[PDB]
Symmetry: D2
Subunit: 481 residues, 4 copies
């Protein structure tokens, strides 16, 4: 245009200057009607949004999922039908640290995967562990607070962390996994991902299986030592973010193979470990892995904030053929994510490009702040006599199950082999090597250093419950100093 200057204000008119304010002479005050200054500063002041809680610190990439086996006998979901290729988005993260925190702290890592399927966005929001610390969502707020900062000093605190874990012994399986080698992945490319929960798969005939998801890295599982991780935390707080971005940019596209475990509907009720208990794995002897397909990440974001920070994943984002399960943790998650995203991003978070599905949305939601894609004169109510369609399926849902009882607050009933310490003990005695046990003792003793004496004594009892020998070695190492 004839009056252009190189940039505009928000109304599209020339900005005049991005470098100097509007003043009364060169020595005078800034005037109130420097609207370019006001607009740019007001926007700057509103750039930051609340960080996620948990999983604030993370990054990710786009890719593709390709089905390479036939699992139509287990699910009718379009995404998993033979040959299907689907675009994906994967965000990796740590659990406890804030936006600016080092990537190489000892922590659980998130593995949040979206499939842009032809029947909607399917989100599989997993971790780099098959289990979690808890089995009821009422405890989750407590757990995450115990992993963050003391209320007075603003410092993370080992006493608080161990006080919570030792008073919640359901934590023992995941704490063992976390304190083992896998607590410190070398890169996100060299860790596995897991759904952790049991999900329901429903086939075209209406038959149900309980499934676990396992994403096995084709780059192998590789871990850092405590010393190596500390050093990297000081040298490069964004070590994992950079590693992923630079690997993809140079064409070194990471891959994972997806396998499921499939338990028949009726055997879910009788298996010796509760499949609806998030602190339990399903033995690969009883239920071996079945191959589904391969995930590849092959495209970096163009804008990290718009495509990764503003991405909103939810386990509630199921597609036909895939349902939730009786797992209390999973049912808590069905509520919590969308709720957080309305505050963190806004009411219309799911209209942002990264969160939009590929298929047509026809949803009964109107108005609200920042409504970019309005529904014109579509009817706002159902049934209507205006030809604007609605859903009205009645009766049992395809992805459901049964329940019976009185309203209660209590622990899940124990199956034959259920307890708090058994699987942890197997991991320590049978899965770890001798050298991994030595490292484990050092890791756990390091973590208990400076823990208040009463809590430290409870931690020794906890580790002896996991394994009498490991527990004694940890106590001896702590007392040796």
């Amino acid at each position: 245009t004839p009056h252009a200057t190189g940039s505009t204000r928000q109304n599209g008119a020339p900005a005049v200057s991005d470098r100097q304010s509007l003043t009364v002479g060169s020595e005078g005050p800034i005037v109130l009607h420097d609207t370019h200054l006001l607009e740019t500063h007001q926007h700057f002041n509103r750039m930051n949004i609340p960080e996620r809680r948990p999983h604030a610190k993370g990054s990710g990439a786009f890719g593709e999922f390709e089905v390479t086996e036939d699992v139509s006998k287990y699910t009718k979901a379009l995404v998993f039908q033979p040959g299907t290729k689907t675009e994906t988005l994967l965000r990796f993260s740590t659990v406890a640290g804030e936006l600016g925190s080092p990537d190489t702290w000892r922590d659980v890592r998130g593995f949040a995967l979206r499939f842009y399927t032809e029947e909607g966005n399917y989100d599989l929001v997993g971790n780099n562990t098959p289990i979690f610390f808890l089995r009821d969502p009422m405890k989750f707020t407590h757990f995450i607070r115990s992993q963050k900062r003391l209320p007075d000093s603003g410092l993370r605190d080992a006493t608080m962390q161990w006080d919570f874990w030792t008073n919640n012994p359901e934590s023992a399986h995941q704490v063992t996994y976390l304190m083992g080698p896998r607590g410190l992945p070398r890169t996100w490319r060299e860790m596995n991902g897991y759904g952790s929960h049991t999900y329901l798969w429903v086939n075209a005939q209406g038959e149900k299986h309980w499934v676990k998801y396992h994403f096995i890295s084709q780059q192998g599982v590789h871990n850092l030592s405590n010393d190596e991780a500390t050093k990297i935390a000081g040298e490069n707080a964004d070590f994992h973010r950079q590693d992923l971005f630079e690997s993809i940019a140079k064409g070194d596209h990471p891959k994972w193979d997806l396998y499921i475990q499939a338990i028949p509907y009726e055997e879910g009720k009788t298996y010796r470990f509760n499949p609806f208990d998030l602190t339990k794995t399903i033995s690969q002897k009883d239920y071996p892995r079945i191959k589904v397909g391969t995930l590849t990440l092959n495209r970096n974001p163009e804008n990290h904030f718009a495509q990764i920070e503003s991405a909103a994943f939810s386990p509630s984002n199921t597609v036909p053929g895939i349902g939730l399960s009786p797992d209390r943790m999973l049912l808590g998650r069905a509520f919590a994510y969308h709720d957080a995203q309305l505050y963190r991003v806004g009411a219309h978070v799911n209209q942002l490009p990264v969160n939009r599905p590929k298929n047509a949305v026809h949803n009964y939601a109107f108005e609200g702040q920042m409504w970019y894609d309005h529904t014109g004169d579509r009817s706002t109510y159902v049934p209507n006599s205006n030809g604007d369609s609605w859903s009205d399926e009645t009766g049992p849902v395809d992805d459901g199950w049964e329940a019976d009882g009185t309203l209660t607050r209590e622990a899940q009933a124990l199956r034959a082999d259920d307890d708090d310490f058994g699987q942890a003990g197997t991991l320590v005695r049978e899965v770890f090597s001798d050298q991994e046990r030595d490292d484990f003792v050092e890791t756990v003793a390091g973590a208990l250093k400076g823990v208040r004496q009463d809590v430290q004594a409870r931690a020794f009892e906890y580790w002896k419950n996991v394994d009498a020998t490991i527990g004694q070695r940890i106590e001896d190492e702590v007392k040796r100093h």
Copy 2:
């Protein structure tokens, strides 16, 4: 898709039912993981946004502006060059009432006009009056609060309104206009619009004129009586909204002619009324109207909320060739609108379709909640060595003026004919007819009924200052009851 049901959730998957919740059997409780119920209720709960303050209650339409005369000697603005046609949006409103308040209350009406020009959105945010009640923005918050509700009872209150007006005698010109016939327009189609403020026009050679805008209705000015307006308020609270929507729908497209008054830069400093005082008109004897063009409204909104409620107008939205003026009220407005819109709508209010310009925006603003149109890897700083342009014009701005003095808080200096009551007195004695004066006395006496005695006595003095005779008639009518 094969599993469709008639509508979707927000992730695009089938909703299953828009009519029944997910329960444990037909008689059981609703389950927490009824995510369709949660999403639709959470969205419903976030549909309402803060109403505008002031001007909450309003509606509008799209149209066109066509230049039919040559005013290139006064401005280089593209919108006003010979022959130019521009799409427009016009929102009409009342000042004091809330979202659900009757259209036919006695009030100032807003006349908010946007031109989608080739060099950006130009907003002329006017009223149905050429003047306003005040001449310094510090008093505006006080004024609007006095026009709303008492803090204890939540009732509008005549005592509060007259207490403010009589203690702020600058109000007299606009209060006279408001209490006259034009306080009650029959329809928005039958009222005039005015910029009210003086604006600066700059031509291609850099010469400046001070201008006033006058939009003269081609449907004439027609008004209701007090009794007629009261009756309509009870029968149809949305009388004006409906009138406009139904007039356009049946092809009865309303029109206004735009005229300006143009005062040479140097005569602005010497004119006998202060052109930078928003309580003053410029006499049509001294500065006659010059025709510019014609505004037509010819298209109803498709979605009232997205296109009218979410529209964000600002006097700060100037285009090259048009600037603000020394008027303190106008300079206050340059800050206030954008600020309100960041809270009312959101940081990215100007990315909503109705607020987007027609030309390319290249603005240094990134991130924030609800960022729909991201800037990819564009540089976030200036100067940069990446070929992402910026503005850096130095020296006096084209749409500026001079100032000199010490930092002060005080009234504007009086010109030869400036005072608080003169122009009001002219309106009453010379512009109104005899019958309009009779109606005026009745209107003002009605408004003063039940005003607390000390404030009512100050109101009699105020009206006698406007005109000794009108004031005595008002006092006599009030005392007669």
Copy 3:
């Protein structure tokens, strides 16, 4: 202080002027560092908060509840033990109109009552009707949207309202009540309040009764005609608000008597009308009213916004001895209110004085915006070893019940006398008088005027289902015009 000026800025320093802005000389521009101007305008721009949806328009008063009978055999709740006196807050409202809408429109009225009890705030959030239009919360968003504005024009629309009601015939009982005399209360003092839902009462021995609440006005039930209500809507949009405020100010304190109906736990499952269906009343022949006590309103708010607009009521605010019931509508409400209030007011809405309980709050919630009353160094997790207490009751809850079934979306099962039109027909034929039936025909025919022909035909069928004779009279009146 020695430098005082009459008012302060937000930091407590002298404001200097509430009336003039800071300028470069008397004729110069406003400077950016007029911080008093900025602060007052930025606050002004953030004064408005989202209106409630529904029930935007309302007002209320404080009072007292006094138990005058013995109902300890039905509940252990402290509020209802013999002799107990409790402070109360009552907010009245209409359902569909916005903040500025006339009080005297035909509508359901809200009757929202809080008791500040010694074991927490007990909220009984009722209406001026014992029933509602719907029995599943999934339909509530649809219903409220159908009662508001068309998406294109922003007008309320009779076709939309009747299209929703006739396609949802469960609506017939409440629509009959609404179109009858009680749709237009003369004052809030002259209407009854009802809980509408069945609630659970639990006594000290753990025995359960299902209860309905009935608040019978001691001023009687008095109603306006259509013509009278229209006239008042034009003359005084705040007629009910003013009536209540002025009645209390002059010592005319309104009173209601509270009665319950009490159904034994086991008879709830077998009664011939479903007590868990919000469209049904419980016959006073089967279950007569039992007197509890008297509510009096005797104190106006000191600040309407802080004490009434910012009040946050929720059916989830139960106290020991009182629980929710299997009613799907009530269980939907347990989620929805708190969710809306977090957006409308803020995360810490329940720390505002009006929403705070009288007893000590010891809640596991920390941080968030606007945290006025912080918890110092209290532990943020449970169990802790720091002596900060927590709750851990296990097993069946005292205020619970049983369920069994598969996850389904379907209508509640019908009891012996359940249907959509029976109770409506009783209200029309047996409860109304002859003159009330004549008025009813006129009201309903008036409401159907200008309803689109296909929807109007469905409305005639609907009214004939209610009562063959009333339906024919309505059709004949509509066709007569």
Copy 4:
């Protein structure tokens, strides 16, 4: 109370369990009406607020300021009158990193000090440097973005930082200070604080001086090496936060002495360095330091979030006797802080206990979200006839100055010794030691490693402009690798 359980919900009623959710039998789904679960999760999801931008990462303490000298000849401010003792709050921070970022990165440190004075909160919001990188606020948004993350990868980037600095050569003085020893303080206790800007002091007779503030640590200035800082960043990201909290807890109370430089009003216009240019120091030869008093920090926060994270400091928080100056940067800050705080914390941020003044606030601001301390029935407008006071001082303000010119966007005029590189050159050649110059060369060469070649070449030219020798050594070190 008789039904207590150990904790409450938000309404004060017993929570029943903080550890288990409400389910249909022990194996069943969670019910929607688990309101304790919903409330605790909804609050958890709203705990995080937007981090500050800049200065996200910080901590602080309470203390006292004691005047020990007589400066009444320079100011009438109550806080600085002989003998006066005032409570203080001090927040320390880094500029560029996010909430979780290591304390021991090379950066400017903030020194934000509040005095709770008897005439309002006085905020002196300083840095650990007397200068800044820029002299016009229009460039500040650009600068801070260049110090944060690349838009595509989310990585901090040396090229972006040096591209901005070398294209903005006004940056040279502060960049030299930053790349010197003081870029890495050992603890916050061992750094100085400075106002950086010139402020105006006005005495009881109305005489003005331009002042600079200098807070000289009584613990001395001590710094880390690059290697030491890197190591600590990996071992303890919260090293400075912990150091301060633990020093105060053990009674090792840090102290600073406050000195001012005082330039007579008229000499401000003629001094050879522009005192209104934030990139310039005032020579201690021309204007020696004058002692005022001593700051001590002696009390840790009880709640870090409520007292430190939610603290809202602003340079606009002046008190009588202290004003802003012509410095464009300072005038930009007068707007920006309050604006950011309305979004970050909320409209009523200044009612939170930490932000409240000690004296009585009488401010014309009403309503808004989260209004804890309402104004009852106080008048909402001025003048009023209700005895609610207001300010109306007219004429020149006590803390003002003069201006004259046309509206312009351009660089400040140069004084006799003003340029971009002179003071930087003095710091390098005269203030640093030989060993500090060696470390400087290593620091700057390290920072330029991997900077894109075109930008690196501009950086060599920039450092040669600072000092021909230092610049050549830096170039040689970079090329040596």
